[PDB]
PDB file of C-alpha atoms in Angstrom:
ATOM      1  CA  UNK A   1     -62.694  46.561  21.473  1.00  0.00           C
ATOM      2  CA  UNK A   2     -61.701  46.736  17.791  1.00  0.00           C
ATOM      3  CA  UNK A   3     -64.167  47.239  14.855  1.00  0.00           C
ATOM      4  CA  UNK A   4     -62.035  45.730  12.253  1.00  0.00           C
ATOM      5  CA  UNK A   5     -60.259  42.445  12.333  1.00  0.00           C
ATOM      6  CA  UNK A   6     -56.388  42.999  12.127  1.00  0.00           C
ATOM      7  CA  UNK A   7     -54.046  40.511  10.625  1.00  0.00           C
ATOM      8  CA  UNK A   8     -50.139  40.666  10.132  1.00  0.00           C
ATOM      9  CA  UNK A   9     -48.457  38.044   8.191  1.00  0.00           C
ATOM     10  CA  UNK A  10     -44.946  36.876   7.219  1.00  0.00           C
ATOM     11  CA  UNK A  11     -43.086  33.877   5.648  1.00  0.00           C
ATOM     12  CA  UNK A  12     -39.278  32.902   5.556  1.00  0.00           C
ATOM     13  CA  UNK A  13     -37.515  30.017   3.871  1.00  0.00           C
ATOM     14  CA  UNK A  14     -33.951  29.149   4.304  1.00  0.00           C
ATOM     15  CA  UNK A  15     -33.511  27.570   0.747  1.00  0.00           C
ATOM     16  CA  UNK A  16     -35.349  27.223  -2.516  1.00  0.00           C
ATOM     17  CA  UNK A  17     -36.698  24.901  -1.657  1.00  0.00           C
ATOM     18  CA  UNK A  18     -35.665  24.628   1.929  1.00  0.00           C
ATOM     19  CA  UNK A  19     -37.112  24.734   5.432  1.00  0.00           C
ATOM     20  CA  UNK A  20     -39.347  27.803   5.818  1.00  0.00           C
ATOM     21  CA  UNK A  21     -42.229  28.777   7.949  1.00  0.00           C
ATOM     22  CA  UNK A  22     -44.760  31.521   8.805  1.00  0.00           C
ATOM     23  CA  UNK A  23     -45.672  33.978  11.410  1.00  0.00           C
ATOM     24  CA  UNK A  24     -49.344  35.386  11.423  1.00  0.00           C
ATOM     25  CA  UNK A  25     -50.887  37.464  14.115  1.00  0.00           C
ATOM     26  CA  UNK A  26     -54.694  38.254  14.011  1.00  0.00           C
ATOM     27  CA  UNK A  27     -56.759  40.289  16.320  1.00  0.00           C
ATOM     28  CA  UNK A  28     -60.376  38.968  16.297  1.00  0.00           C
ATOM     29  CA  UNK A  29     -63.019  39.351  19.054  1.00  0.00           C
ATOM     30  CA  UNK A  30     -61.063  40.316  21.951  1.00  0.00           C
ATOM     31  CA  UNK A  31     -58.091  37.975  21.563  1.00  0.00           C
ATOM     32  CA  UNK A  32     -54.756  37.700  19.787  1.00  0.00           C
ATOM     33  CA  UNK A  33     -54.463  34.332  17.991  1.00  0.00           C
ATOM     34  CA  UNK A  34     -50.876  33.589  17.199  1.00  0.00           C
ATOM     35  CA  UNK A  35     -49.932  31.219  14.535  1.00  0.00           C
ATOM     36  CA  UNK A  36     -46.597  29.626  13.336  1.00  0.00           C
ATOM     37  CA  UNK A  37     -45.219  26.540  11.802  1.00  0.00           C
ATOM     38  CA  UNK A  38     -42.301  25.310   9.958  1.00  0.00           C
ATOM     39  CA  UNK A  39     -42.161  23.160   6.872  1.00  0.00           C
ATOM     40  CA  UNK A  40     -39.107  20.964   5.898  1.00  0.00           C
ATOM     41  CA  UNK A  41     -39.024  21.722   2.248  1.00  0.00           C
ATOM     42  CA  UNK A  42     -40.774  24.701   0.616  1.00  0.00           C
ATOM     43  CA  UNK A  43     -40.360  28.196  -0.575  1.00  0.00           C
ATOM     44  CA  UNK A  44     -40.595  31.759   0.306  1.00  0.00           C
ATOM     45  CA  UNK A  45     -43.486  32.326  -1.746  1.00  0.00           C
ATOM     46  CA  UNK A  46     -45.428  29.501  -0.464  1.00  0.00           C
ATOM     47  CA  UNK A  47     -44.826  30.581   3.250  1.00  0.00           C
ATOM     48  CA  UNK A  48     -45.968  34.154   2.580  1.00  0.00           C
ATOM     49  CA  UNK A  49     -49.061  32.525   0.864  1.00  0.00           C
ATOM     50  CA  UNK A  50     -49.829  30.212   3.874  1.00  0.00           C
ATOM     51  CA  UNK A  51     -49.396  33.146   6.524  1.00  0.00           C
ATOM     52  CA  UNK A  52     -52.275  34.702   5.053  1.00  0.00           C
ATOM     53  CA  UNK A  53     -54.214  31.531   4.549  1.00  0.00           C
ATOM     54  CA  UNK A  54     -54.247  30.211   8.003  1.00  0.00           C
ATOM     55  CA  UNK A  55     -55.116  33.788   9.524  1.00  0.00           C
ATOM     56  CA  UNK A  56     -58.191  34.051   7.172  1.00  0.00           C
ATOM     57  CA  UNK A  57     -59.413  30.470   7.707  1.00  0.00           C
ATOM     58  CA  UNK A  58     -59.649  31.462  11.316  1.00  0.00           C
ATOM     59  CA  UNK A  59     -62.649  33.867  10.666  1.00  0.00           C
ATOM     60  CA  UNK A  60     -65.726  31.972  11.011  1.00  0.00           C
ATOM     61  CA  UNK A  61     -68.105  34.734  10.223  1.00  0.00           C
ATOM     62  CA  UNK A  62     -67.846  37.391   7.463  1.00  0.00           C
ATOM     63  CA  UNK A  63     -65.660  40.269   8.619  1.00  0.00           C
ATOM     64  CA  UNK A  64     -63.904  43.383   7.563  1.00  0.00           C
ATOM     65  CA  UNK A  65     -60.287  42.680   7.621  1.00  0.00           C
ATOM     66  CA  UNK A  66     -57.078  44.773   7.262  1.00  0.00           C
ATOM     67  CA  UNK A  67     -54.255  42.646   6.236  1.00  0.00           C
ATOM     68  CA  UNK A  68     -50.730  43.916   6.733  1.00  0.00           C
ATOM     69  CA  UNK A  69     -47.690  42.188   4.928  1.00  0.00           C
ATOM     70  CA  UNK A  70     -44.374  43.011   3.636  1.00  0.00           C
ATOM     71  CA  UNK A  71     -44.731  40.164   0.917  1.00  0.00           C
ATOM     72  CA  UNK A  72     -44.442  41.203  -2.703  1.00  0.00           C
ATOM     73  CA  UNK A  73     -45.284  37.900  -4.158  1.00  0.00           C
ATOM     74  CA  UNK A  74     -48.774  38.239  -2.307  1.00  0.00           C
ATOM     75  CA  UNK A  75     -49.148  41.939  -3.411  1.00  0.00           C
ATOM     76  CA  UNK A  76     -48.229  40.835  -6.896  1.00  0.00           C
ATOM     77  CA  UNK A  77     -50.736  38.042  -7.028  1.00  0.00           C
ATOM     78  CA  UNK A  78     -53.349  40.239  -5.421  1.00  0.00           C
ATOM     79  CA  UNK A  79     -52.784  43.447  -7.533  1.00  0.00           C
ATOM     80  CA  UNK A  80     -51.835  41.927 -10.942  1.00  0.00           C
ATOM     81  CA  UNK A  81     -52.334  38.331 -11.393  1.00  0.00           C
ATOM     82  CA  UNK A  82     -55.313  36.681  -9.627  1.00  0.00           C
ATOM     83  CA  UNK A  83     -57.891  38.673 -11.553  1.00  0.00           C
ATOM     84  CA  UNK A  84     -56.516  37.346 -14.808  1.00  0.00           C
ATOM     85  CA  UNK A  85     -55.904  33.761 -13.564  1.00  0.00           C
ATOM     86  CA  UNK A  86     -59.720  33.534 -12.784  1.00  0.00           C
ATOM     87  CA  UNK A  87     -60.568  34.498 -16.323  1.00  0.00           C
ATOM     88  CA  UNK A  88     -58.153  32.079 -17.779  1.00  0.00           C
ATOM     89  CA  UNK A  89     -59.272  29.319 -15.468  1.00  0.00           C
ATOM     90  CA  UNK A  90     -56.050  29.261 -13.370  1.00  0.00           C
ATOM     91  CA  UNK A  91     -53.831  28.829 -16.289  1.00  0.00           C
ATOM     92  CA  UNK A  92     -50.853  30.474 -17.721  1.00  0.00           C
ATOM     93  CA  UNK A  93     -50.306  31.621 -21.331  1.00  0.00           C
ATOM     94  CA  UNK A  94     -49.001  28.252 -22.428  1.00  0.00           C
ATOM     95  CA  UNK A  95     -52.171  26.909 -20.853  1.00  0.00           C
ATOM     96  CA  UNK A  96     -50.554  25.222 -17.792  1.00  0.00           C
ATOM     97  CA  UNK A  97     -51.740  25.523 -14.260  1.00  0.00           C
ATOM     98  CA  UNK A  98     -50.004  28.516 -12.593  1.00  0.00           C
ATOM     99  CA  UNK A  99     -47.347  28.079  -9.936  1.00  0.00           C
ATOM    100  CA  UNK A 100     -48.843  27.367  -6.603  1.00  0.00           C
ATOM    101  CA  UNK A 101     -52.412  27.282  -7.807  1.00  0.00           C
ATOM    102  CA  UNK A 102     -53.130  25.100  -4.941  1.00  0.00           C
ATOM    103  CA  UNK A 103     -52.305  27.778  -2.454  1.00  0.00           C
ATOM    104  CA  UNK A 104     -53.685  30.611  -4.617  1.00  0.00           C
ATOM    105  CA  UNK A 105     -57.122  28.925  -4.952  1.00  0.00           C
ATOM    106  CA  UNK A 106     -56.998  28.159  -1.194  1.00  0.00           C
ATOM    107  CA  UNK A 107     -56.406  31.935  -0.450  1.00  0.00           C
ATOM    108  CA  UNK A 108     -59.128  32.914  -3.128  1.00  0.00           C
ATOM    109  CA  UNK A 109     -61.803  30.809  -1.399  1.00  0.00           C
ATOM    110  CA  UNK A 110     -60.965  32.716   1.957  1.00  0.00           C
ATOM    111  CA  UNK A 111     -60.633  36.204   0.608  1.00  0.00           C
ATOM    112  CA  UNK A 112     -64.129  35.716  -1.005  1.00  0.00           C
ATOM    113  CA  UNK A 113     -65.844  35.422   2.409  1.00  0.00           C
ATOM    114  CA  UNK A 114     -64.749  38.741   3.758  1.00  0.00           C
ATOM    115  CA  UNK A 115     -64.307  42.588   3.239  1.00  0.00           C
ATOM    116  CA  UNK A 116     -60.482  42.910   2.849  1.00  0.00           C
ATOM    117  CA  UNK A 117     -58.402  46.186   2.923  1.00  0.00           C
ATOM    118  CA  UNK A 118     -54.766  45.351   2.107  1.00  0.00           C
ATOM    119  CA  UNK A 119     -51.606  47.156   3.540  1.00  0.00           C
ATOM    120  CA  UNK A 120     -48.423  46.604   1.785  1.00  0.00           C
ATOM    121  CA  UNK A 121     -45.748  47.436   4.263  1.00  0.00           C
ATOM    122  CA  UNK A 122     -41.964  47.881   3.350  1.00  0.00           C
ATOM    123  CA  UNK A 123     -39.713  45.348   5.133  1.00  0.00           C
ATOM    124  CA  UNK A 124     -37.773  48.116   6.904  1.00  0.00           C
ATOM    125  CA  UNK A 125     -40.911  50.067   7.876  1.00  0.00           C
ATOM    126  CA  UNK A 126     -43.245  47.271   9.381  1.00  0.00           C
ATOM    127  CA  UNK A 127     -45.256  47.755  12.666  1.00  0.00           C
ATOM    128  CA  UNK A 128     -44.326  45.764  15.640  1.00  0.00           C
ATOM    129  CA  UNK A 129     -46.630  42.995  14.705  1.00  0.00           C
ATOM    130  CA  UNK A 130     -44.841  42.624  11.247  1.00  0.00           C
ATOM    131  CA  UNK A 131     -41.506  42.155  13.200  1.00  0.00           C
ATOM    132  CA  UNK A 132     -42.928  39.695  15.639  1.00  0.00           C
ATOM    133  CA  UNK A 133     -44.334  37.749  12.480  1.00  0.00           C
ATOM    134  CA  UNK A 134     -40.710  37.489  10.785  1.00  0.00           C
ATOM    135  CA  UNK A 135     -39.416  36.475  14.209  1.00  0.00           C
ATOM    136  CA  UNK A 136     -42.067  33.696  14.481  1.00  0.00           C
ATOM    137  CA  UNK A 137     -41.344  32.865  10.806  1.00  0.00           C
ATOM    138  CA  UNK A 138     -37.670  32.332  11.231  1.00  0.00           C
ATOM    139  CA  UNK A 139     -37.883  30.434  14.324  1.00  0.00           C
ATOM    140  CA  UNK A 140     -40.444  27.927  12.597  1.00  0.00           C
ATOM    141  CA  UNK A 141     -38.111  27.464   9.459  1.00  0.00           C
ATOM    142  CA  UNK A 142     -35.566  26.418  12.057  1.00  0.00           C
ATOM    143  CA  UNK A 143     -37.788  23.647  13.582  1.00  0.00           C
ATOM    144  CA  UNK A 144     -39.900  22.343  10.776  1.00  0.00           C
ATOM    145  CA  UNK A 145     -42.401  19.665  11.634  1.00  0.00           C
ATOM    146  CA  UNK A 146     -44.824  19.839   8.749  1.00  0.00           C
ATOM    147  CA  UNK A 147     -44.695  18.695   5.118  1.00  0.00           C
ATOM    148  CA  UNK A 148     -45.570  21.052   2.469  1.00  0.00           C
ATOM    149  CA  UNK A 149     -47.663  18.658   0.297  1.00  0.00           C
ATOM    150  CA  UNK A 150     -48.259  21.095  -2.676  1.00  0.00           C
ATOM    151  CA  UNK A 151     -44.760  21.770  -3.335  1.00  0.00           C
ATOM    152  CA  UNK A 152     -43.730  20.919  -7.042  1.00  0.00           C
ATOM    153  CA  UNK A 153     -40.327  21.397  -8.504  1.00  0.00           C
ATOM    154  CA  UNK A 154     -42.790  21.060 -11.592  1.00  0.00           C
ATOM    155  CA  UNK A 155     -46.241  22.768 -12.062  1.00  0.00           C
TER     156      UNK A 155
END
């Protein structure tokens, strides 16, 4: 068995907004949980966020995670933004709530319960689990059943 929890995530969206969905694979305990869902109206950014969210909300105890994703909006949030948003009380420079604060606060709550190592893969050099995620991702966007509540044309 594996000593570290492994998570692979991916999001897709056909429009902006449009139908999109996610693919997430997590190796926890001795199983391979596979997650995927399509949303009728949403964005690429929100699906790449959701990928990462459902995977972590799966962990019921504090674990050491290694999360691998080709998502730059997530990388960006994680390496540049989130730290500042917390300081700023989840607001932008002109004092408005940031875009997708609903999803970033949600991922934030989840990240906070674990020890996370991030692996940022280039879309053309992912691991087989990353490819299967994209595949799951695309399938879902194609047959969406859920509503992405938190979507705002607005802010």
